[PDB]
Amino acid sequence: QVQLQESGGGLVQGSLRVSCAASGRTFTTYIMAWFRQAPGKEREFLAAMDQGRIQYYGDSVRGRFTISRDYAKNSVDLQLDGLRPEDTAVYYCAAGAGFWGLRTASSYHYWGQGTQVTVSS
Amino acid sequence: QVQLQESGGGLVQGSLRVSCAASGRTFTTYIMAWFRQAPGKEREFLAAMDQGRIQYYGDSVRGRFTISRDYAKNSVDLQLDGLRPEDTAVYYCAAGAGFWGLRTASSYHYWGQGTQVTVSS
Amino acid sequence: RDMCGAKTGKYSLGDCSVRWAYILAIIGILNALILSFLAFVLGNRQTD
Amino acid sequence: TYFLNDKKSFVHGVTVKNRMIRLHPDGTVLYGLRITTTAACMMDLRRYPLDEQNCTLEIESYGYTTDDIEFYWRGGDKAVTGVERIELPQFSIVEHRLVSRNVVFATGAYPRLSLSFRLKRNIGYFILQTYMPSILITILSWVSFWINYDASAARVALGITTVLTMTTINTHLRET
Amino acid sequence: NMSFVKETVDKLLKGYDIRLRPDFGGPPVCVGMNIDIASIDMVSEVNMDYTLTMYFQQYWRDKRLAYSGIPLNLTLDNRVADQLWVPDTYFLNDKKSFVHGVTVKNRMIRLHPDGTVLYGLRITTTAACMMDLRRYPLDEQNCTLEIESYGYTTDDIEFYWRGGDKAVTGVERIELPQFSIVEHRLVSRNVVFATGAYPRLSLSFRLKRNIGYFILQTYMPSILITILSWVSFWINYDASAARVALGITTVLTMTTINTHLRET
Amino acid sequence: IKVLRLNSNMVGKIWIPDTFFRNSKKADAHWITTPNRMLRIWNDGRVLYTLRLTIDAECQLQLHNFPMDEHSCPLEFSSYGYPREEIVYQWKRSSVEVGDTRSWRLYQFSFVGLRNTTEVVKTTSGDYVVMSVYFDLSRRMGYFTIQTYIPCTLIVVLSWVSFWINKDAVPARTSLGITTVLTMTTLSTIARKSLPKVSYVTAMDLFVSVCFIFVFSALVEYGTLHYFVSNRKCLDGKDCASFFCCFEDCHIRIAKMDSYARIFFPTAFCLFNLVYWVSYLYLG
Amino acid sequence: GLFHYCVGSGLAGRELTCRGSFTDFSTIPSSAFKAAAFFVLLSMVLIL
Amino acid sequence: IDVFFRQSWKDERLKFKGPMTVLRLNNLMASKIWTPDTFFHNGKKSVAHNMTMPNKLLRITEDGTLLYTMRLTVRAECPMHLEDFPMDAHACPLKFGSYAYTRAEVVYEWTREPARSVVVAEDGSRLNQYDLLGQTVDSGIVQSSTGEYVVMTTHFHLKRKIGYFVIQTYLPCIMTVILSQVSFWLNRESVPARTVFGVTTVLTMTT
Amino acid sequence: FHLKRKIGYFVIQTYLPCIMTVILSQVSFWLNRESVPARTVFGVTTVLTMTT
Amino acid sequence: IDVFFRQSWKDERLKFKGPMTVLRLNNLMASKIWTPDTFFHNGKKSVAHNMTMPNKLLRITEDGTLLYTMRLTVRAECPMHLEDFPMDAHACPLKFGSYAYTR
Ligand SMILES: *[C@@H]1O[C@H](CO)[C@@H](O[C@@H]2O[C@H](CO)[C@@H](O[C@@H]3O[C@H](CO[C@H]4O[C@H](CO[C@H]5O[C@H](CO)[C@@H](O)[C@H](O)[C@@H]5O[C@H]5O[C@H](CO)[C@@H](O)[C@H](O)[C@@H]5O)[C@@H](O)[C@H](O[C@H]5O[C@H](CO)[C@@H](O)[C@H](O)[C@@H]5O)[C@@H]4O)[C@@H](O)[C@H](O[C@H]4O[C@H](CO)[C@@H](O)[C@H](O)[C@@H]4O[C@H]4O[C@H](CO)[C@@H](O)[C@H](O)[C@@H]4O[C@H]4O[C@H](CO)[C@@H](O)[C@H](O)[C@@H]4O)[C@@H]3O)[C@H](O)[C@H]2NC(C)=O)[C@H](O)[C@H]1NC(C)=O
Ligand SMILES: *[C@@H]1O[C@H](CO)[C@@H](O[C@@H]2O[C@H](CO)[C@@H](O[C@@H]3O[C@H](CO[C@H]4O[C@H](CO)[C@@H](O)[C@H](O[C@H]5O[C@H](CO)[C@@H](O)[C@H](O)[C@@H]5O)[C@@H]4O)[C@@H](O)[C@H](O[C@H]4O[C@H](CO)[C@@H](O)[C@H](O)[C@@H]4O)[C@@H]3O)[C@H](O)[C@H]2NC(C)=O)[C@H](O)[C@H]1NC(C)=O
Ligand SMILES: *[C@@H]1O[C@H](CO)[C@@H](O[C@@H]2O[C@H](CO)[C@@H](O[C@@H]3O[C@H](CO[C@H]4O[C@H](CO)[C@@H](O)[C@H](O[C@H]5O[C@H](CO)[C@@H](O)[C@H](O)[C@@H]5O)[C@@H]4O)[C@@H](O)[C@H](O[C@H]4O[C@H](CO)[C@@H](O)[C@H](O)[C@@H]4O)[C@@H]3O)[C@H](O)[C@H]2NC(C)=O)[C@H](O)[C@H]1NC(C)=O
Ligand SMILES: CCCCCCCC/C=C/CCCCCCCC(=O)O[C@H](COC(=O)CCCCCCCCCCCCCCC)COP(=O)(O)OC[C@@H](O)CO
Ligand SMILES: CCCCCCCC/C=C/CCCCCCCC(=O)O[C@H](COC(=O)CCCCCCCCCCCCCCC)COP(=O)(O)OC[C@@H](O)CO
Ligand SMILES: CCCCCCCC/C=C\CCCCCCCC(=O)O[C@H](COC(=O)CCCCCCCCCCCCCCC)COP(=O)(O)OC[C@@H](O)CO
Ligand SMILES: CCCCCCCCCCCC(=O)OC[C@H](COP(=O)([O-])O)OC(=O)CCCCCCCCCCC
Ligand SMILES: CCCCCCCCCCCCCCCC(=O)O
Ligand SMILES: CCCCCCCCCCCCCCCC(=O)O
Ligand SMILES: CCCCCCCCCC
Ligand SMILES: CCCCCCCCCC
Ligand SMILES: [Cl-]
Ligand SMILES: [Cl-]
C-alpha cells in the first residue's frame, strides 16, 4: 500500500523546509507536487517537479518557494522563504501522472496526509 | 565424381602453357591454385587465383609465371615463361576453399593427375 | 486484330493461318469420339 | 574525443545542432553536445533472465597521446548525473562507476575514461511469459495419473498435448 | 563558339541576388508544375503511407536570367541551381524524402532566352495516407500529395498545373501488386494559416484493392473449414471422440487463422 | 607526359556527365576510405571517369510460373538534363563485363546471361538516349522444393494412410483427415510468405490447392463410407439406355470404397504430378 | 494459343514478346479464349 | 508529431526603412543572422525537412521584429504506466527550450495565451489506437550543470481505444472459456472427448 | 579470417527436438495394438512436429 | 569488423626543421595534403566514424614520413558454402587497395 509521509515545522514567526517521502512505489517516472489548502479556500497548486527535473510553479508562489526531488530516496522537498500570514494552511504532498493536469488536483492519484503550517506576526 | 583434367607440353629446349579444366563440380567459387613437386621435394605453391580475379604468386615465380582463369569454362591456365633446367618438375592443379591456407597444399580438397615438364639445354 | 490484321474477325482467319495445335485438337476430337464408341462396344462385349 | 565501443551515434540537429560553446575571461572553454550513441555491450546470457550485465562507454582521445591531452572526470564521482532518474522497464541500474586510465596501442599511449553501469534484469515479465505456463503445463501433465490405464486415447492425448505445448513455449522463446 | 556562351552565363550570374525572388516588389511569380510518376512502391497499411518516385519539374520566368544572341536553350550543370533562385516548394504530407544523387544530383536546370527557367528534380517521397479499413479488403483508398509553397504567400507566388489536366503523366504505367489506380485527379486552391494564405496543388490517386490474394488466402480456407465442420453431422451420435475432435479442431483453426491474419 | 592520372579531386573541377539510373529505387557511391572515383586525362583531350556504385534497381517480376519462373531484369541509365541533341551515349565493343558469375549473392536465382541495348525515350523535357542492360535470371528449385513441395506431398500421403486403417476406428480416421487438412492450410499459408501479395495463382498455389482437394476428398471419402456403413445402416437393337447407360445394377458396392480409394488416390496424384511437372518444365 | 501468345516487335528480327497465362485470367485476350481454355482443361481432366 | 514551429523576436540591428514594411526573404537569409538555438528536451530523433528546399521562412519587419518558422517532425519520449492497459491513458510531453542560453540570456514566452498558442489541425490526426482528448500548455524552469533554462512544455492527453484488444485477446479468451465449459454437458463416459476439450482449451489459452 | 561455426545453438534447438520426436514416435510400438486412436495420435502428432 | 586502419608513406614536400621532431596535428590537415585512395574491394557500405570529431589522426615526421590512421567499421563480403551447415567453416576475406593508382 502506497504512503506519502510528510515532515516539517508547524509554526513560524521566516524560512521553512517541508519534505515528503514516498513508500510502496517508486515515483521516478511520476510528477511530484505540492498543494496548499487554507481554511475555507479550495486546494491550490504550489509546485510540481517532473522526471526531467523540470519545475512548475504557481503564480502566487513563483520565486519564493523552491521544489526539489531526491530520486534515490524517492522524496520531494519544498523550501519556503518569505513567509507571510496568508501562507498559513495545510500543505499536501502528491504524486501523479499529470493527466489533464500538472495543476489540477484531480490528476494526482496519490496524496499525503497533509502538514499544518502557520505564520504569526 | 569430381576431376581436374590437366594438359600442356612435356618437353622444351622457353615458353609453355598448362591448362586445367574442371568437370563434375563448379570450381568457379573455389580458389584455384597451381603447385609444383619435383622428385624428392614437398608440394610447393606456385600460383593461385581467387573468385575476385585476384592473383597470388610465389616468390620463386613472381614475375615469370602468370595465372589466369576462365569462369564460364571453369578452367585455370598457367603461362610459364623463362623456363630453366632447374624448373623441371611435375605440375599439379588444385582447387578448394582456402581455409587456414591459400599457400599450403592441405587447404585444397581437390587435385589433378599432374603433368611432367622438362627443360633441356 | 493487331497481330493478324484488319481482315481478321469473328469466325474468320484473315491473314493468319491455322497451325499444328488446332488441327491436332480436331484430331483429338475425332480420336476421343472414336475411343468413346470403342469403350461402349467393349463394355457391351465383355458381358457377351 | 570519440567513443571506442560506438556503433552508431549522432549529434541532435533540431532546431539546430544541439551544441554549446561558452567562453570565460581567462580563456576557459566549455563545449557541450547532445549525443545519442548506440554502444556495444557484450552480454553473458548464461544466467539469463536471472543475469547481471556490465555495459560501458569508453571515451578516448584519438590523435592525441598522453603527452598532448590528459582526460579527467571533473567533480570526481559527481561527474556523471541523471543515472538515478533512469527507469528502464526490463532492467534496474544497480550501480554506476567512473574509471580513468591509460591505454597503449602501437601508435602510443592515450587517455581513457570509462563510464560503466551494472544492470540487473527484472524477472516479473519472464515469470508471466515463460516460467508460469511451463509450471502449469507440467502440473496438467500429472492429471493422466488419475485416469484409468484403459483410457489410452485420453491419457496419450493429454501427454502429447503437454509435450506439444512445451515445444511451442520453447519455440516462441527462441524466436526472440 | 563557347567563349560567347561563357561570357553570357558569367554576365547573367554576376550581380544576381539569390535572396530576392524574380519580382520582389512586383506582382507574384507564376510557377507551373508538372510531374512524371516513375513508380509507386510500398502502399503500407501498417505505416499508413506510400512511397512515390517522380520527376518533379517547375517552370517559371526570371527576367534577370534573360539572354540574347544565343538561339539555344542552355541546359546548365546542376551545380548552378544553388546559385540561382528556385521556389521553396514542399510536400505537406511528407514523412521522408530525398533527391537521388547517383552519379550526381539528379537535378536539371535549363534557361531560355526570355529568362524562363525549367527546374527538374528526381524525388522519391514517403507520403502519409491515412486509410479507412472498415471495408478492407474490399476498400477503396484516396492517397494525396499536397504541394505547397512554404515561405511565399499568394501575394508572392502562384501555383498552377502546367498543361492542365495533362500535367501529371505516367499514372497508367504503374503496376501495384495489391492495388489498381482507378483514377487520378489534380486540384489547385489556397490554404490559409496564421502566417498568411499560400497556394496549394494536390495530386490525388484512388486505389482499388485486389481481392484475388484474399480469396486465395482467407475466404477459401474458411469456407473449406466450415464444410469440414458440417461433416460431423453425418457421423454417428455415439462417435463422441471423433465429433468433438472435428468440432474443436475447426473452431480453434478458425480462431487461429483469424488471429494470425490480423497481425500484419 | 601523355596522360594525367588523378584521384577524385578534379571530378568536381571539370565538367562531368549527369548520368543517372532511371529505374533506381536507391543508389549510392562509395566513400571509404576516400571517394571510389578515378580520372584520367589524355593529351588529345580524352577524359576517362570511373566510379564505384551500388544500385537497388526495380525489376517488375511476373510470378505466374513461380518457382519455375524466369526474369530479365533491366538496368537503364541516361543523362538527366541533356537531351539527345546535347549528349549521346554509346556502348563500347565489350561494354558489360562480369567476373565470377555464380560467386555472387544470387541465392534463389542463377545468372543465365546479359544483353545491352540503346533507345530514345521521349519526355516533357525532350528526347533522351537511354542505355539499358538486361540481366537474365532463372529461379532455382531447391529451397522451395524443400519448403513446400515435399511437405505437401508427404501430407497427402499421410492422408492416404487413413484408407488402410479399419473403418471402425472412427476417432482415429476422423482426426487423421482433419489434421491433414489443417497442415495443408498451414502449408498454404507459409508458402506465400516469400512472395509479394499478388492477386493471381502461381504454380505453387495450384499445386498446394490440388493437394488440398486430395486431402479433402480423402476426408469426404471416409465420411461417406462411415455414413453408409454405420450411421445410415439401334444397330445392336439393344435399348439405348441399356446399351450405353447403366441402369442395370446401378449404390450397393459401397463397403469396398476403401479398397477402391487405396489404388485410386495414388494413381490420381501420380497423374497430376506427371502432367504438372512435365507441363511446367518442358512444354512451357 | 488458347491463353498464351507471342508477338513480334517488328524491327526485322524475332524479339517475340510473350504474354498470357491460364493461372491469371486477366492476361487472356478475350472471354471466348477463357471459355475455350476452360473447356479444353475440362476435357483434359475428364480423360485423366 | 509534425509541427510548424514559429518563433519571433526583436533584433534592433535589422531595422530598416524601405518601400515595404515586411521583407519576406528566402530561408538562406536565416543562416546569415542570429536565430535561437531551440531544441526539444525529450526529443529522440527529429527531422528538419529540406524537400525541395529548407522548409523555413524568415520575415523581417521594418521595426526589427523577426518572424522565423520551421517545419519539423519530432519523435519525442512519452513514458507510460501500463497497469491499466488497454484501459490506460497518458499525457505525452513536448518540451523545448534554449540549449546554450540560460534564463538571464534568453527567455521563451507564448505568443498568445498558452491555450491558444498551440493549435492542432482538424484533419491532422494520424493516430490509430488513441484519441487525442486535448492539450495543456505550460512553462517552467530546469536546473542543469550549466545553469537555469526556461522550458516551454505542452502535454497531449491521449486515451487508448480498447476495440483492437477486445477483438484480439478478450473475445478469444471468452469463447475459449465457453468452449471449455461446454464439456460439462457431455456424458461422463466420453473420457477422450472431454479430455480433448480440456487439453485443447488449455493449449489455446497458453498460446 | 578463418571462422568455425558453433554447433551448440543448433544442437539445442533442432537436433534434440528431432531426436525426441523420433523417440516419441517409436514409443507407440509399446502400446497394445487395439489402442488405435492413441497410436494414430502418436503417429500424426509426431509427423506434424517433424514437419514444423 | 571495427578497425584502426593505419597507413604510412614518405612525402618529400612535407619535410621541415623545427623544435618538434613529430607534428601530431589535427585531422583537418589530411584534407589539405595528399593521402592514398585506399578502398575495400569486397566492402559493402563501410562507415567512417565522425563522433565527436572525425576519428582520424595525422603525424608528420621531420624527414617527411607521414602516418595517417582512421577508425572504420568495415562491412565486407564473406561468401559461404552451407553444404556442411551447421558443421561448416569459412574464410572471410578482407581485400583492399588503391582505386585510381595502378601498380
Ligand atoms: C537535406 O539536408 C541534408 C543534410 O544537410 C543534405 O544532405 C547533405 O547534402 C550535402 C550537399 O549535397 C552533402 O555534401 C556533399 O557530400 C559529398 C559526399 O557525400 C558522401 O559523403 C557524405 C559525407 O561527407 C563526408 O565524406 C565525404 C567522403 O569522403 C567527403 O568528401 C566529405 O567532405 C565529408 O567528409 C567529412 O566527413 C567524414 C565523415 O562523414 C570525415 O571522415 C571527413 O574527415 C570529413 O569531416 C555523406 O553524407 C553522403 O551520404 C548522403 O548523401 C548521399 C547523396 O544524396 C546519399 O546517397 C546518402 O544516403 C546520404 O544521405 C555521401 O556518403 C561531397 O563529395 C560533397 O563535397 C564535394 O562537393 C562540394 C560541392 O558540392 C564541395 O564543396 C566539397 O568541397 C566537395 O568537393 C571537393 O571534394 C570532391 C571529392 O574529392 C572533389 O571531387 C571536388 O573537386 C572538391 O575538391 C576540392 O576540394 C577538396 C576539399 O573541399 C579538396 O580536398 C580537393 O583536393 C579539391 O581541392 C559535399 O560535401 C552531404 O554529404 C549530405 N548529407 C549529410 C548527412 O550532410 C541534403 O542534400 C538536403 N536535401 C536537399 C534537397 O536540400
Ligand atoms: C564493469 O566491468 C568493467 C570491466 O571489468 C570494470 O572495469 C574495471 O574497473 C576497475 C575498478 O573498478 C579498474 O581498475 C581500476 O583502475 C584505477 C585507475 O587505474 C589507473 O590510474 C592509476 C593511477 O594513475 C594507475 O596506477 C593504474 O595503472 C595500473 O596500476 C595498477 C596498480 O599498479 C595495476 O594493478 C593495474 O594493472 C593498472 O593497469 C591505472 O592506469 C585504479 O585506481 C583502481 O584501483 C583500486 O584498487 C587499487 C588496489 O591497488 C588501489 O590502490 C586504488 O586506490 C583503487 O582503490 C582500479 O585498479 C579497471 O581498470 C577497469 N577495467 C576496464 C577495462 O575498464 C568496471 O569497474 C565494472 N563496473 C561496474 C559498475 O560493474
Ligand atoms: C481524393 O480525395 C480528396 C480529398 O477529399 C479529394 O479532394 C477534393 O477534390 C475536389 C475535386 O473533386 C476539390 O474540389 C474543388 O475545388 C476546385 C478549385 O477550388 C478552390 O477553387 C476556387 C479558387 O480557384 C475556390 O473559390 C474554391 O472555394 C471554396 O469553393 C466553394 C465555393 O466557391 C466551396 O466548396 C467552399 O466554400 C470552398 O471554401 C476552392 O477553394 C473547384 O473549381 C471545384 O469546383 C468546380 O466545381 C464547381 C461546382 O462546385 C463548378 O461550378 C466548377 O466549374 C468546377 O467544375 C471543386 O470545388 C476539393 O477542393 C478537394 N479537397 C481537398 C481538401 O483537397 C479528391 O478530389 C479525391 N480524388 C480522387 C481521384 O479520389
Ligand atoms: C452460454 C452462451 C454464452 C455466449 C455469449 C458469448 C458472449 C459474446 C459477446 C461478446 C460481447 C463483445 C462486446 C460487444 C459490445 C462492445 C464492443 C464495442 O463497441 O467496443 C468498444 C467497447 O468495448 C468495451 O470496452 C466492452 C468490452 C466488453 C467485452 C466482454 C463483455 C463480457 C462478455 C460476456 C461474459 C461471459 C458470459 C459467460 C456466459 C457463459 C466501443 O468503445 P466506444 O464506442 O465506447 O469508444 C471507442 C473505443 O472505446 C473503442 O475503439
Ligand atoms: C524441446 C527440446 C527438448 C529437448 C531436451 C531434452 C533434455 C536432454 C538434453 C540435454 C541436452 C544438453 C545440451 C548440451 C549442449 C549441446 C552440446 C554441445 O554443443 O556441446 C559441445 C559438443 O557438441 C557436439 O559434440 C556436437 C554433436 C552433439 C550431438 C548430440 C546428439 C546425440 C544423439 C544420439 C542419438 C541417440 C539415439 C537413441 C535412440 C534410441 C561441446 O563442445 P565445445 O565446448 O568444444 O563447443 C564447440 C562448438 O561446436 C560449440 O559447442
Ligand atoms: C491454397 C488454396 C486452398 C484452397 C483450394 C481449394 C481448391 C481450389 C482449386 C483450384 C481453383 C482455385 C481458384 C483460385 C482463385 C483465385 C482468386 C481469384 O479468382 O482472383 C481473380 C482471378 O485471379 C486469377 O488470376 C485466377 C484466374 C485463374 C483461376 C484458376 C486457376 C487454375 C485452377 C485449376 C484447378 C484445377 C483443379 C483440378 C483438380 C484435379 C482475380 O481477382 P482480382 O480482382 O484480384 O484481379 C486483379 C487483377 O489485376 C489480377 O491480375
Ligand atoms: C505402401 C504400399 C503397400 C502396398 C502393399 C501391396 C499389397 C498387394 C497385395 C494385393 C492387395 C490385396 O489384395 O489386399 C489389400 C487390398 C484388399 O484387401 P481385402 O480387404 O479385400 O482383403 O487391396 C486393395 O484393395 C488395394 C491394394 C492397393 C495396393 C497398393 C496400391 C499402390 C499404392 C501406391 C503407394 C505410393
Ligand atoms: C456439406 C457436405 C459435407 C460432406 C458430407 C460427406 C458425407 C455425405 C454422405 C452421403 C450424403 C447423401 C446421403 C443421401 C441419403 C439421404 O437421404 O440421407
Ligand atoms: C509416394 C508417391 C508420391 C507421388 C508424388 C511424387 C511427387 C514428388 C515431387 C517432389 C518434388 C519434385 C521437384 C522436381 C524439381 C526438378 O524437376 O528439378
Ligand atoms: C472482373 C472481376 C472478376 C473478379 C473475380 C473474383 C474471383 C472469384 C472466384 C470464384
Ligand atoms: C461435397 C461432396 C459430397 C459427396 C457425396 C457423395 C455421395 C455418394 C452417394 C453414393
Ligand atoms: Cl498459364
Ligand atoms: Cl496510434
How would you describe the overall organization of this protein?
The structure is cut from a larger assembly and holds 2 copies of chain A (121 residues), 2 copies of chain C (48 residues), 2 copies of chain D, 1 copy of chain F (284 residues) and 3 copies of chain H. With 48 residues, chain C is mainly α. Chain C contains 1 helix and no strands. Chain C is rod-shaped. Chain F is α+β, with helices and mostly antiparallel strands. Helices cover 36% and strands 23% of the residues of chain F. Chain F contains 5 helices and 9 strands. In chain F, the strands form 3 sheets. In chain F, strands 2-7-9-8 form a 4-stranded antiparallel sheet, with no helix packed on it. In chain F, strands 1-4-5 form a 3-stranded antiparallel sheet, with no helix packed on it. The longest helix of chain F is centred in the C-terminal third of the chain and has 29 residues, at 203-231. In chain H, strands 1, 2, 4, 5 and 6 form a 5-stranded antiparallel sheet that branches. Chain H has a 4-stranded antiparallel sheet with strand order 3-7-9-8, with no helix packed on it. In chain H, helix 2 (163-182) packs antiparallel against helix 3. Chain H is of the alpha+beta class and 207 residues long. In chain H, strand 5 and strand 6 form a beta hairpin. Chains in contact: A-D, A-H, B-F, B-J, C-F, C-G, D-H, D-I, D-J, E-F, E-H, F-G, F-I, F-J, I-J. One ligand PGW sits between chains F (188, 199-201, 205-206, 208-210, 212-213) and E (210-212, 215-216, 220-221, 224). It is classed as membrane protein. Keywords: GABA, Neurotransmission, Synaptic capture complex, Inhibitory synapse, membrane protein. CryoEM structure of human full-length alpha1beta3gamma2 GABA(A) receptor in complex with GARLH4, the TMD of Neuroligin2, GABA and Megabody38, in a desensitised state (StateD1).
Based on Cα principal axes, name the global outline of chain D. Answer: elongated
What class, by secondary structure content of chain D? alpha+beta
CA-CA gap between termini of chain D: 36 Å
Helix coverage percent of chain D: 10-25%
What is the beta-strand fraction of chain C? under 5%
List the total number of helices of chain C: 1
Oligomeric state of this protein: part of a larger assembly
Rg from alpha-carbon coordinates of chain C: 19 Å
Biggest interface, chains and residues, is: E-F, 55 and 57 residues
Q: Helix and strand string of chain C, N-terminal first? A: H
Q: What share of the residues of chain C lie within helices?
A: 55-70%
Q: What is the tally of beta strands of chain C? A: 0
Strands of the widest sheet of chain D, in order across it, are: 1-6-8-7
State the end-to-end distance of chain C.
Answer: 56 Å
Gyration radius over CA of chain D: 27 Å
Helix count, DSSP H or I runs of 4 or more residues of chain D? 2
Subcellular location (chain I): Postsynaptic cell membrane; Cell membrane; Cytoplasmic vesicle membrane
Transmembrane segments (chain I): 11-31, 37-52
Organism (chain I): Homo sapiens (Human)
Family (chain I): Belongs to the ligand-gated ion channel (TC 1.A.9) family. Gamma-aminobutyric acid receptor (TC 1.A.9.5) subfamily. GABRA1 sub-subfamily.
